[PDB]
Design a protein around this ligand. Structure first.
Ligand code: HEC
Ligand code: HEC
Ligand code: HEC
Ligand code: HEC
Ligand SMILES: [Ca+2]
Ligand SMILES: [Ca+2]
Lengths: 355, 125, 376, 129, 376, 354
């Protein structure tokens, strides 16, 4: 049943029949050749993805599905910090909820309702055999049961070893199979001693069994609007992406502007960066953190535009305690971090490092 | 207590300078002034900065990265003073350097040295 | 048996092995209880000093407080706050002087008040616990000023303000009895009752002269504010008890702490905080050894214990170390605390058997004053 | 060094706690931090106030009044610490009391305790000591 | 043969016998000479510190200077003043930080300057003599900054004022060579030459990288400003010599301070100030002992002496105490000074024979830094 | 010659022949029954003395001759402080210079010149025998030699044990002959440990062979003008007594308003007090020092007049380092200082203490 369920997820994953006009599958925006991200050029470059209708742009960068199965279900922990979930704003509890939401989102896959999904599943002979073996006869005639089963299969497929293979250079080095280059070694060391480790390690202390370089928390790091993506998404110039506060049932204004800390695995190959695809380069995303620590004028400047980073989209709730470390990354340590984070690339994506 | 002999880790008393996690500690163990192995005493402020060392754990034969963080904004505790230097590098490699007061990032810009905690932050390599 | 340091190691090893996460953070002191004891370290007149907060039951340091030059510690009887009156300078021991009062939360140890004392009014002396005193409610702190003349500073902890200096005659120490009243001890051998309404001169009434010019009352009497009991040794072991619970001074029958033959064979009190008093037991403890008449400030190796009502020696303790100051917890079946300035160590004994239970070393440079809360 | 034994004055070493003039010294001997028996070290401020004692001079069998004056405005020296109490009285007789920091009248209102000098200011004639 | 405490009790009793009068007063310290020595007590990180000014010839403390939190001492070579960069807080160790420089008269020890450093810019590190440094003419003090980036602050001692911070590359320590120029040691193994005006991106030049990433250069090189000689040991006692006399870096041949057989038998440099250099004799002194490779901050019992031109060993003294720091007077017939942190004691040795001559004890809590003036 | 010289000083001392109109001798203002002070009432009470002409008032209180011979000759010492001399302003080097000046001062003995003095000496048969024996024949015909010899005799007389007998209760206590009363003893202790000893002991440290409770220095303690004496002296309401700066050859303005520290011996019997007799009572004079230390309003008040002390006559060069001791004398200690100071009374003047 575990193999089988996952095998169904695989079929569903690449089936454009789960989109309204049958033009796109999960694999369209979550392309396996590119660490499950979108390689397609839209009105805003690679920043945001184009929907089933061929025009509608999202306001958020499409993230990797690699390692998403490692994220705990959404919850508030004993100290009042939200952890886990799926999407940049945590609006899905887990992989299963999230599958259903993506299928129904009108700016993306855009199925009208659970029943429309059910009809599409019902249309295909291999789905009848496949769903009924796992869920019981006539599952596909119950719009609720069918849809739910579909999401479950998609979820089970993203939990396969294939989405989280733990075969990066970093993984091999921790097994003792290879050594780091001195640059990479220095990079790793900088990463564990500087602020990065306060948000991009699973645990506060201890060793993680399956490290994915995120504590699964919610932070506002004070990013600007990505202007071309915001224009393209057509949400409007007055629109504010509130991050986690957008999740239904979150009312706390202290969450506004906060986004799920992304796993840094495969980061070297999944540009552009942040929740709005605002920076094209990995180096820029690192340099960004210098805005909070450095005294040099160059630190105010986005090296991509040659102009100030820009006002944060949300000016409150900034993670200042973490971000204002009092210590600036010189060019040396930036290069080092780049060498380290590159080591986090899955074996199968190492060829991609070159371009 | 031949101070020049190779340092010998134990995993049985945290308040002693030969406790394994303290292999590059400089200053004072926080457990001795009302903190604990991995927390600051009341009234002090926890820095965000560290120096690391790889310290051998004689219990499991494994080596762990220890990020020493300072508890600041109080005068030096005076209790359980210790100084070890396994893998300690000169100041020009500040990552591994332990004469530096690592109080950066402490609330209220506290920069005075009280004591040092010894949390594990990773497995070494 | 097993030191707190070994148990910690096991706690930590189990945490690692079972993979428990835990956020590094600022701890909070365990709630103040009867067996919490504060030790101050005057540091032989160093410019900066340390107070140590100790769990007397486990023998563990549970926090510390920093202080300036020869600070005055107070501990709220009910447990609700501690405080000191302290002194700093712009350039370590030189430059502009600021005297101030801090009020601290007793579990976070964070200051909840910083109250500047105008015109640097503090009495700079080897620490006497009753040269700065809390009043029954804890709404006022009063402190001693010596220069240009004996005086008493009124500080309002509740409104977080200094209020005024009170004129007093040639008198010493402050033992408050009421929100607006305190006794001091005067040169002429009397006690003065000082009662102040804010707005001009306080009512001053002296008691009767209660000791001769040539009987010497020590710098460190013991006083129980909840009991109204003052216990003042003389250099010889004689004990003046004055009961203040009525509002005015009633003098109890004086009582010898050392027998006639013990005195003749060179026995005398000696140390710093030489005397302790237990409220519920109405029982007195005193540091004694064989010493010359002018070595009254030196460590003693024995404690004696006696009934305050009668004077009957209830036990003699051999302490085992050079003890400078003693005090007791005010719970049932109390602890006898014995602090060695030389050893920098607080020794903690059973106040029934006098057997040493455990000890807390490394308390600064010359620790001298032991304070405890009287919580029931 | 039986700390409780009757104090025994010598007139041969001023840096030791049993030197005769130090019979009621509290703190540190200024001679140990660049002062001298009767002068303050550089940078410190000489107070005008004192506590007296009558100290027996084992050399000439005479008793002399010693007015201890403090050198202030510096942190405690930490060298040659001493505490003797010959004729020392409780605080309420401050003339003879030595827990008090006697830094009154020091230049620049210096009140911190560095060390104590031991000058003779007269020949004794006393009633408690 | 006879102690200075005895010669004063001898002189004192003669004044009292002769009716020789004298005004109690504030001494002047003797004139600064070659044999004067300064010992700093970082106090193991205490919020306030001490410096001891010492006459090496008599082994007498002649004066003291109060400091803040890890102050950096300097001593002007010509004897005209000393100074420190120092740090204080409004509430002992908590509250608002003020970093400042003080200049002192070397005979009165009064401060003649007190220059504030804006935005509390000092590097707080265990004390390294060449983290704060005087230009040769004594007109500028340069201090190192680490947070947020390596930087070097410029303080005008003549106009008594903070000038500017310089941006430098990822480098460390300051060795001034001219009124307007100094060298640093960079992470990358080069030295950086920094040349600076009142404004301008300073001209920054790098030498050859002169050691690999895994040769380790100690926190305490000896630097002689008047010879232009920087003497730099590694963990193994291999020594780099750099000659900055011409104003550019020339490299002398590296010398081994310990033989290959002494290295095979576990001999390493270790301690704090491990190296000293005498200019007139062109001579190197290294603290060395048998020790594990990671015990390089522990004390050492041996000093080895070597000709700087050749590397030829001249002597191997056995110090007979645990020694953390060494230095030398710069006159003919120099004193080898040797500081025990453990003992809080300065031992004063003949540098030629190694014989211990005298000691100065009780130098604080954790004395570590010896400074001498080169007046020759 | 020592006995003889002094014996001649004795005759001269009580001879009114050395005043212009033959009305007064040294003894007139320096009366042996009152510790060699002036007991006579003038326009300003006992504050200032009336001259030979029966109207002229001095501006300064006549001081005791008791113990004057212990004062060193006037000199600047190695640290720039003037010490010694005679008169409240040090204008005379020594006892001998001083005799001459008082003899010539027109508001006092008022002799016209050395020659007029010589004539008066020459007139008397006992002076011819007496001077010629000591100074040679015809000394009295040389106005200079005669005048100088008289001055010398007068000086020699004031050096006799009688003017400085060292027989006070304080002196007896220091020899071990008697004990202090506990009040007196507290007094002495206060005196040696409080600021008083910084100016009213011979030495800085050590033990004086013949203590006279003065270091012979010059200080401005910031006294006010004595209003009635200044009116009486006729110097004018604009006049400023400059103290030491008035001494010829003193040019330094730091000396302005400074006066010779007087010996405290016999102070209990030699009121009123200070250079201008401003305070009638010994207790006041003590209480005056409290103006520099005390925070109580009563300290700003002269208990004699019930009004503020008054502005200093000279507002510069105050001895503030000494006077601002930071410690206030309570009524207890003032009583004690009185008891102590009274023990400084010569044996022969103890009856006067009542
Ligand atoms: C919380 C206080 C963080 C700190 C400290 C660091 N990072 Fe971070 N990172 C954080 C968040 C919440 C996010 C998403 C922000 C958003 O709103 O889009 C990120 C993102 C990155 C990325 C790009 C990831 C991606 O788009 O896939 C990188 C490369 C990254 N962060 C690196 C990084 C480095 C190198 C840090 C130390 C200098 C660092 N982060 C600190 C949260 C936090
Ligand atoms: C009143 C008219 C006097 C006569 C007659 C004599 N003296 Fe006098 N004397 C008088 C005053 C007001 C003063 C102080 C004057 C001043 O300006 O300071 C003095 C002072 C002296 C002193 C100095 C004592 C001291 O300063 O401590 C001496 C030694 C002295 N007088 C002696 C003296 C002699 C020898 C006289 C007869 C020749 C004589 N006095 C007469 C007031 C009067
Ligand atoms: C120098 C700073 C002094 C100190 C301290 C004390 N005294 Fe003084 N005293 C001083 C001077 C210069 C004078 C005369 C000043 C003047 O202008 O006349 C005095 C005077 C007295 C007197 C009066 C004696 C007399 O008129 O014959 C008394 C009784 C006296 N001083 C007492 C006294 C006491 C008790 C002191 C300690 C509180 C004290 N003096 C201090 C100089 C100084
Ligand atoms: C293009 C439009 C698509 C399509 C066809 C799919 N997704 Fe996927 N996805 C897309 C965007 C723009 C985002 C970010 C959305 C936001 O934050 O608002 C996502 C996100 C996910 C995630 C969450 C990853 C994370 O938060 O760390 C998952 C697990 C995911 N998407 C999976 C998924 C599945 C199962 C799909 C087919 C049903 C699918 N995506 C299609 C853009 C697009
Ligand atoms: Ca991306
Ligand atoms: Ca008079």
């Amino acid at each position: 049943a575990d193999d089988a369920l996952a095998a169904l997820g695989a079929q569903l994953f690449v089936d454009p029949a789960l989109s309204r006009n049958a033009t796109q599958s999960c694999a369209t925006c979550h392309d396996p050749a590119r660490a499950f991200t979108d390689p397609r050029e839209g009105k805003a470059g690679l920043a945001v993805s184009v929907g089933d209708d061929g025009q509608s742009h999202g306001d958020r960068n499409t993230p990797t599905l690699g390692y998403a199965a490692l994220v705990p279900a959404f919850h508030r922990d004993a100290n009042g910090k939200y952890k886990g979930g799926q999407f940049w704003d945590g609006r899905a509890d887990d992989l299963k909820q999230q599958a259903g939401q993506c299928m129904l989102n009108p700016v993306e896959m855009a199925m009208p309702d659970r029943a429309a999904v059910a009809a599409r599943l019902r249309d295909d002979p291999a789905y009848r055999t496949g769903f009924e073996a796992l869920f019981g006869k006539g599952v596909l005639d119950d719009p609720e049961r069918a849809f739910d089963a579909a999401a479950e299969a998609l979820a089970a497929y993203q939990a396969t070893g294939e989405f989280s293979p733990f075969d990066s250079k970093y993984d091999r080095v921790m097994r003792g199979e290879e050594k780091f280059t001195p640059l990479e070694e220095f990079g790793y060391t900088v990463f564990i001693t500087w602020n990065c480790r306060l948000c991009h390690m699973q645990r506060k202390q201890g060793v993680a069994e399956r490290e994915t370089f995120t504590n699964f928390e919610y932070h506002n790091i004070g990013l600007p609007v990505n202007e071309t993506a915001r224009e393209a998404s057509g949400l409007g110039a007055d629109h504010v992406d509130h991050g986690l506060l957008a999740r239904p049932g979150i009312e706390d204004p202290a969450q506004s502007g906060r986004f799920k800390v992304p796993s840094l695995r495969n980061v070297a190959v999944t540009g552009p960066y942040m929740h709005n695809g605002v920076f094209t380069d990995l180096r820029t995303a690192i340099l960004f953190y210098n805005k909070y620590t450095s005294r040099r004028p160059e630190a105010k400047i986005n090296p991509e535009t040659g102009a100030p980073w820009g006002e944060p989209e949300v000016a409150r709730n900034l993670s200042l305690a973490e971000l204002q470390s009092g210590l600036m990354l010189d060019d040396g340590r930036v290069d080092a971090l780049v060498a380290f984070l590159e080591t986090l690339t899955d074996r199968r994506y190492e060829p991609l490092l070159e371009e | 207590t031949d101070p020049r002999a190779k340092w010998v880790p134990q995993d049985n008393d945290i308040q002693a300078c030969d406790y394994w996690r303290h292999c590059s500690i400089d200053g004072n163990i926080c457990d001795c002034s009302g903190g604990s192995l991995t927390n600051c005493p009341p009234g002090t402020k926890l820095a965000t900065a560290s120096w690391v060392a790889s310290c051998y754990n004689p219990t499991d034969g494994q080596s762990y990265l220890i990020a020493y963080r300072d508890c600041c904004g109080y005068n030096v505790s005076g209790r359980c003073p210790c100084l070890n230097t396994e893998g300690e590098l000169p100041v020009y490699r500040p990552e591994f350097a332990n004469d530096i007061i690592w109080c950066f990032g402490a609330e209220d810009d506290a920069m005075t040295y009280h004591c040092t905690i010894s949390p594990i932050v990773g497995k070494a390599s | 048996q097993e030191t707190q340091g070994q148990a910690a190691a096991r706690a930590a090893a189990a945490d690692l092995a079972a993979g428990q996460d835990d956020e590094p953070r600022i701890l909070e002191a365990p709630a103040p209880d009867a067996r919490r004891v504060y030790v101050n370290d005057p540091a032989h007149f160093a410019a900066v000093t340390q107070q140590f907060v100790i769990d007397g039951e486990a023998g563990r340091v549970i926090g510390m407080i920093d202080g300036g030059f020869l600070p005055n510690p107070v501990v709220a009887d009910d447990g609700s706050f501690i405080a000191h009156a302290s002194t700093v300078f712009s350039r370590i021991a030189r430059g502009e002087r600021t005297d101030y009062v801090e009020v601290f939360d007793p579990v976070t140890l964070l200051p909840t008040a910083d109250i500047e004392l105008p015109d640097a009014p503090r009495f700079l002396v080897g620490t006497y616990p009753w040269m700065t005193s809390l009043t029954p409610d804890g709404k006022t702190l009063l402190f001693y000023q010596f220069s240009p003349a004996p005086a008493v500073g009124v500080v309002d902890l509740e409104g977080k303000a200094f209020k005024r200096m009170l004129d007093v005659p040639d008198c010493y120490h402050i033992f408050p009895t009421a929100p607006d009243t305190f006794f001091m001890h005067c040169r002429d051998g009397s006690l003065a009752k000082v009662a102040f309404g804010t707005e001009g001169t306080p009512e001053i009434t002296h008691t009767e002269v209660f000791h001769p010019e040539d009987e010497f009352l020590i710098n460190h009497p013991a006083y129980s504010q909840k009991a109204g009991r003052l216990v003042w040794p003389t250099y010889t072991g004689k004990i003046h008890q004055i009961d203040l619970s009525s509002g005015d001074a009633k003098f109890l029958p004086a009582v010898e702490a050392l027998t006639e033959a013990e005195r003749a064979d060179g026995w005398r009190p000696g140390g710093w905080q030489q005397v302790a008093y237990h409220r519920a037991l109405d029982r007195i403890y005193l540091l004694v050894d064989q010493r010359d008449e002018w070595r009254h400030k030196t460590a003693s190796r024995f404690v004696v214990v006696l009934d305050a009502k009668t004077g009957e020696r209830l036990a003699k303790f051999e302490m085992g170390h050079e003890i400078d100051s003693i005090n007791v917890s005010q719970d049932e079946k109390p602890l006898l605390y014995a602090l060695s300035t030389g050893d920098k160590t607080l020794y903690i004994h059973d106040a029934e058997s006098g057997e040493e239970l455990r000890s807390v070393n490394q308390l600064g440079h010359g620790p001298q004053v032991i304070t405890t809360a009287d919580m029931g």
